[PDB]
């Protein structure tokens, strides 16, 4: 699975907020977030979305997300 760097998080919901409006993305399975981590384990496939666009999805939010 491919996995994001953020360097936007405030840690107030906003972990969850990134795991869930990834699991939105309309081709990730399960995604997850560690905290103190700043990285995001997603569960996708290519064959639905890409991980790039996964990006978006998190910079869509309000911080800052880099594909790793």
Same mark, same amino acid.
């Given at each position: 699975a491919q996995e994001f760097s953020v360097k @936007?998080? /405030?840690?107030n919901h906003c972990v969850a907020r990134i795991e869930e409006a990834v699991g939105?993305? /309309? @081709?990730?399975k399960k995604v997850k977030v560690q905290l103190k981590k700043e990285k995001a384990v997603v569960k996708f496939d290519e064959a639905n979305v890409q991980a790039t666009e996964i990006c978006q999805a998190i910079n869509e939010l309000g911080y800052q997300a880099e594909v790793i």
């Open positions: @936007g998080m /405030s840690c939105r993305i /309309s @081709g990730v």
